Design an enzyme around this catalytic site. Structure first.
Site, PDB file in Angstrom:
ATOM      1  N   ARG D  78     -13.606  -2.912 -14.955  1.00  0.00           N
ATOM      2  CA  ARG D  78     -12.581  -2.099 -14.327  1.00  0.00           C
ATOM      3  C   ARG D  78     -12.638  -0.658 -14.833  1.00  0.00           C
ATOM      4  NH1 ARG D  78      -8.112  -3.814 -11.668  1.00  0.00           N
ATOM      5  NH2 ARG D  78      -8.307  -5.993 -12.196  1.00  0.00           N
ATOM      6  N   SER D 120     -13.962   6.003  -0.235  1.00  0.00           N
ATOM      7  CA  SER D 120     -13.480   5.302   0.961  1.00  0.00           C
ATOM      8  C   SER D 120     -12.054   5.658   1.346  1.00  0.00           C
ATOM      9  CB  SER D 120     -13.602   3.811   0.770  1.00  0.00           C
ATOM     10  OG  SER D 120     -12.580   3.269  -0.096  1.00  0.00           O
ATOM     11  N   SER D 148      -9.663   8.942   6.154  1.00  0.00           N
ATOM     12  CA  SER D 148      -9.039   7.676   6.465  1.00  0.00           C
ATOM     13  C   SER D 148      -9.617   7.074   7.736  1.00  0.00           C
ATOM     14  CB  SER D 148      -7.537   7.845   6.657  1.00  0.00           C
ATOM     15  OG  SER D 148      -7.265   8.530   7.872  1.00  0.00           O
ATOM     16  N   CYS D 149      -9.287   5.798   7.979  1.00  0.00           N
ATOM     17  CA  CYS D 149      -9.664   5.127   9.217  1.00  0.00           C
ATOM     18  C   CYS D 149      -9.008   5.790  10.434  1.00  0.00           C
ATOM     19  CB  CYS D 149      -9.455   3.613   9.096  1.00  0.00           C
ATOM     20  SG  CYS D 149      -7.825   3.043   8.510  1.00  0.00           S
ATOM     21  N   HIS D 176      -0.618   0.419  13.791  1.00  0.00           N
ATOM     22  CA  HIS D 176      -1.648   0.097  12.823  1.00  0.00           C
ATOM     23  C   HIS D 176      -1.399  -1.275  12.177  1.00  0.00           C
ATOM     24  CE1 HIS D 176      -4.377   0.703   9.409  1.00  0.00           C
ATOM     25  NE2 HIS D 176      -4.775   1.873   9.965  1.00  0.00           N
ATOM     26  N   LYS D 188       9.732  -3.869  -4.440  1.00  0.00           N
ATOM     27  CA  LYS D 188       9.453  -2.485  -4.770  1.00  0.00           C
ATOM     28  C   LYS D 188       8.222  -1.959  -4.081  1.00  0.00           C
ATOM     29  CE  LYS D 188       6.768  -1.443  -8.174  1.00  0.00           C
ATOM     30  NZ  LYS D 188       6.056  -1.292  -9.450  1.00  0.00           N
ATOM     31  N   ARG D 230       3.208   0.695  11.049  1.00  0.00           N
ATOM     32  CA  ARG D 230       2.536  -0.545  10.641  1.00  0.00           C
ATOM     33  C   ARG D 230       3.235  -1.726  11.326  1.00  0.00           C
ATOM     34  NH1 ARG D 230      -0.748  -0.159   5.981  1.00  0.00           N
ATOM     35  NH2 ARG D 230      -1.946   1.766   6.175  1.00  0.00           N
TER      36      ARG D 230
END
Ligand SMILES: NC(=O)c1ccc[n+]([C@@H]2O[C@H](COP(=O)([O-])OP(=O)(O)OC[C@H]3O[C@@H](n4cnc5c(N)ncnc54)[C@H](OP(=O)(O)O)[C@@H]3O)[C@@H](O)[C@H]2O)c1
Ligand SMILES: NC(=O)c1ccc[n+]([C@@H]2O[C@H](COP(=O)([O-])OP(=O)(O)OC[C@H]3O[C@@H](n4cnc5c(N)ncnc54)[C@H](OP(=O)(O)O)[C@@H]3O)[C@@H](O)[C@H]2O)c1
Ligand SMILES: NC(=O)c1ccc[n+]([C@@H]2O[C@H](COP(=O)([O-])OP(=O)(O)OC[C@H]3O[C@@H](n4cnc5c(N)ncnc54)[C@H](OP(=O)(O)O)[C@@H]3O)[C@@H](O)[C@H]2O)c1
Ligand SMILES: NC(=O)c1ccc[n+]([C@@H]2O[C@H](COP(=O)([O-])OP(=O)(O)OC[C@H]3O[C@@H](n4cnc5c(N)ncnc54)[C@H](OP(=O)(O)O)[C@@H]3O)[C@@H](O)[C@H]2O)c1
Lengths: 330, 330, 330, 330
Positions: D78, D120, D148-149, D176, D188, D230
């Site tokens: 990581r 990405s 972004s996409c 989206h 949260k 979304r």
């Protein structure tokens, strides 16, 4: 005396209209025509996957008892020509089946005690009214349409914003919950996108924006068009208006115009959300449109995007019963 | 010569049966009867929200061309008495409408060139066969049922496990994807739980376990019962068998018995998943049942739980066409 | 004086515990520790996609005011060793984070004014109690576990049915709503099935049935086992018990035994549904288990299937606060 | 020799990038860094709830073998400062973790054999390129962003339509699919709408339209703004552009301009759907945008609405690898 109504058809809108009307002291639901068995009708009134539980009882004589409507006769006759509301002395029919959405078809209800019909949908050749938009133009027509749920959300907003800033053109998208017109799994439909599984897809589908606005706001009809996208939610929808105005606008000035209208000419019809809520929070909301205050935006001097929530079942049904009360007294 | 079949009804099962049959070199689909318009039928064959895309073409003469079936006549006649497959010389009808699930009703297909009917559902008074379970008992009956998708999953497992360990009793639950019999939003249904929104709820619903097993495994019918729970997935189901045996069992011994059967008497019918997959992984699987190897468990000496996946559309449809091939040759 | 509790962690269970505790006149929530910002915590308490809206206010001093708990101190300290409830004089901690599910870990709360901890989950090496099952065996332990939501549903039923008929063995499946332990889209997880998209799949997953029952019903622990299937619903679960008894049973006799228990020893804990409801109808239900009366079935003399609903968030949270009240007074 | 890439992070985008890159003969994936265990990584590559199954194998030395990439070293570190791709001789890092989206953060990869990084996501202070829009302006920068996409879908369309008709202003909404940044159940989040259950709600959320377009189409940046909604689908999104042009437009002229671009300057990047498909039909589509031909509409002389699909995972990932190939050779 309370206004004597009957509800024809007990799918989503009829069920919601029953619940709404039951809470209005100036209304008496004197009859319901349902293709369900009596016990199933009662069950559907009481228990809703989206809207929760509702109190309703069966009287000893097998009429229903719901809110202020203590003696509701239950009928079960699909054939509009055989259907007879006489034993209940119904005066106004709330037509919720989806199967008689025309002047000619719904005019079959005009017999015996029945004076007026309000159709729960756009209807061919039928005088159309949206509460808060053009309902004061009502002039004793016996069969009227309450338009669509999307028109009830978008026409108030267009009227407010046109009065403030002068709409030159607008484009509308509704991000809309699925309805019972859609298919659970991919199968035949007249609309080859609504053919496809409702819970799995984003589904663009026409909606007759231009024509509807033309009925209720004739000057704006040629200036607006749009479409719907059905998505996998069971209730609550969102209209997205992209507007070009004559007058210059800011995010703040649009916000202020909408808030002012909610205090004044659209009190009880349009509201404002300043709490950053999401669709599920508006389940059972009675408003025709709830503006999303923080998401208003502008670009250039003359363009704005305005979003507003609406419970496509309940806001619309509140308006249906508002219109029944209005046409009975006017 | 390939076996000449026609598919009656083009909902979920009919569409899947078309696709399956199109890939079988020993079958020719000579006709399809659909209530959809031709272009809509083609569209539904080609594009599936769950199963993906499929190649299919319209010939110059407006027959369809799909896989090995290059000349499919398309009909559109709901009335079974007017419906006529003669121009296609169909010999076996795969009856997929859900509207003729009885011996008497489906016997209306027996006219002209038609020799046999296989009904895509349990059917009143109809000889019932499940491939790999009792199909070898077929004795030239002209109208048969292929049972339900749940019976196709559970009867193989019960036969395997009974042969190995002797079933004393079993209880079955299927955790089952929603189907087009269900409702998108809460509305009338004969089953007051299936009335409720399919995508929002867990929905217990009867399934005629005892009676079905009695048809295909008569000795076990009085020993098993169960129910279904419909849940918010669009395809792929899971049978959960809780069994009490005469012989003592272990997790390992149950695993081994099931694996052995998949190599031998249930090859191509039952499979084993050792890869810890989930429901979506079995979309389009051709097996009647895919045992979940790692989730087998036992308690006491005599009890076991066995889970198995099945694509309720595709596994069943593979069996429908297996049965068409079998009854044509036997 | 009301019992002074603090809630540690404000995810699903902590939020539900806040709401439940706020309605209990014998409880005072004196503090909440949340990793959310204060305004976000308030927002989450107020607005729930599944459970609806809740009244909650911010006092002038920036404590919260909810129901009977008018002065709730809000903390934000992830490190259990730095966390200090002293300014609120908390006596019992409701531990809802999921991150301290062991005797050793949760024992870090035992400092300053804190007397006792109740952990909202099975916990290693921790005395475990289920209300109505074995809670009267509590003997002043300072750290206890309230077990899982599934154990709270299944252990009452097993106790009732064992007392009536003598359980020889049982197999349990829970058809269970997804939780925040799961993944929205396919990505890493320790459990390679819970790795997969929660809203798209049926997901078999272990649950430690045998071990849990062993804690609360030691005699039954070696006699039962089972598993979970996570499915695409956001709340409300269903336990499915397949039981083999010593005494002979009928559908009626099982029904009667369960109903009697609901009137007597499990009043307020277990209920019966005779109204043919579905999962969404049990949102916010306070019961540990709601038996599905009409779906009880038997096969052979000795076997039964019993289903029961539970709101895995709210029923469990009602029990958490029941246990806080009990251990404070006993 | 094939371009030696390594993929950092194996969530949605990293998994998709692996699959895409494995199919490119001019690429060699020489390493993958994943926080998953090796067997879990392999499992996630192979089995996707949305995209289906993929072939991938473990070599005898425990490298992976996928498509043209037969010897993929698997790392699990990581800490970007400890992470070392040296044993694989990686030259370009595809940075997919979401945790290093800045020039400063991703510059930690520039050590040993590594020459370049493609991030990405939008990234602070980072040169940003969209393939087909401004990628030819690349000038050997060592760390870049692929935006972004949504920007990959909308910037091609804006460039095409600006070149044809001259954009005066535009408003964008993306409908989206949910992503792993969202929450399964209400808890949260920094964004109090993304806090709310992703599968249950329509969720308005900012997206930095103006700023993104400003990077890739500087002249248009001040002319456009918009937002996202979304919704409960797991993959595939829809951009909705409401545009005001200098030149007069018709539905036909917009259609023709978009189709021409797909044949010429945006071949392989933008496509047209004339088949009336729905979102699920575009799963795994490689295009940045698929225009919905039949839903183009105009109002007034100067305004148009244009919708286009995009697979937010796969179209974007195809572009990521297109950009890796481009920057390696240019
Ligand atoms: N958001 C909304 O849902 C919404 C909002 C505004 C307006 N509308 C409009 O309102 C209408 C109804 O929509 P809905 O969503 O309520 O549809 P729905 O849920 O499908 O309900 C319609 C009901 O009408 C019943 N019905 C059909 N023919 C009948 C007859 N002759 N007599 C009595 N009952 C009959 C149907 O029962 P059977 O299945 O037994 O035929 C069905 O239960 C449509 O025109 C729709 O466009 C809907
Ligand atoms: N998992 C499964 O889905 C599954 C598995 C095994 C067996 N089954 C059984 O198979 C049957 C069909 O199920 P399904 O899921 O495919 O249902 P479905 O998707 O509703 O399809 C049935 C189709 O039949 C059509 N139809 C009805 N009457 C017709 C007629 N007279 N002529 C021609 N077409 C007609 C309907 O079209 P209209 O709407 O135009 O009437 C509908 O598209 C049922 O009995 C079911 O229990 C289903
Ligand atoms: N049906 C149920 O959901 C259910 C029922 C019974 C029992 N349980 C159990 O109860 C526990 C909690 O489950 P849940 O569903 O409520 O999970 P959840 O929704 O994920 O909530 C847990 C919350 O704890 C917070 N948290 C983590 N470490 C913390 C710390 N050190 N201090 C303060 N807050 C911290 C997390 O916030 P961050 O994201 O900021 O870390 C998260 O919001 C689990 O052990 C679960 O098995 C759950
Ligand atoms: N549609 C899309 O999904 C989409 C499209 C375009 C761009 N993007 C962008 O691409 C990025 C990734 O999005 P995503 O959707 O793929 O997110 P995701 O599914 O959450 O995947 C991110 C993965 O990164 C891992 N990770 C985190 N820190 C790491 C580290 N230091 N080293 C290695 N792995 C690490 C995480 O594992 P742990 O859980 O173990 O930390 C997680 O599995 C975001 O910036 C997003 O905005 C997404």
């Amino acid at each position: 005396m309370p206004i004597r109504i009957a509800i024809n058809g007990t799918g989503r809108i009829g069920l919601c209209a029953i619940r709404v009307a039951s809470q209005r002291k100036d209304i008496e639901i004197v009859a319901i025509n349902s293709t369900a068995e009596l016990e199933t009708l009662l069950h559907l009134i009481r228990h809703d996957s989206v809207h929760g539980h509702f109190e309703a009882q069966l009287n000893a004589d097998r009429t229903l008892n719901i809110g202020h409507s203590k003696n509701i006769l239950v009928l079960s006759e699909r054939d509009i020509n055989k259907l007879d509301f006489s034993a209940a002395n119904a005066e106004i029919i709330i037509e919720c089946t989806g199967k008689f959405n025309s002047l000619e078809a719904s005019s079959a209800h005009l017999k015996n005690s029945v004076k007026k019909v309000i159709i729960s949908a756009p209807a061919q050749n039928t005088p159309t009214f949206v509460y808060g938009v053009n309902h004061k133009n009502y002039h004793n027509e016996s069969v009227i349409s309450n338009a669509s749920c999307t028109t009830n959300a978008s026409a108030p907003l267009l009227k407010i914003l046109d009065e403030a800033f002068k709409v030159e053109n607008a484009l509308l998208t509704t991000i809309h919950s699925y309805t019972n017109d859609q298919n659970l799994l991919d199968t035949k439909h007249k609309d080859i996108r609504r053919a496809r599984a409702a819970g799995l897809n984003l589904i663009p589908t026409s909606t007759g924006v231009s024509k509807a606005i033309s009925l209720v706001l004739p000057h704006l009809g040629p200036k607006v068009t749009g479409l719907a996208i059905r998505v996998p939610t069971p209730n609550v929808s969102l209209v997205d208006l992209s507007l070009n105005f004559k007058k210059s606008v800011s995010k703040a000035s649009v916000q202020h115009a909408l808030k002012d209208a909610c205090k004044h000419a659209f009190k009880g019809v349009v509201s404002i959300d300043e709490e950053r809520l999401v669709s599920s929070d508006f389940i059972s909301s009675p408003f025709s449109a709830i503006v999303i205050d923080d998401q208003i935006m502008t670009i250039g001097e003359k363009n704005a995007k305005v979003l507003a929530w609406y419970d496509n079942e309940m806001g619309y049904s509140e308006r249906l019963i508002d219109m029944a009360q209005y046409i009975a007294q006017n």
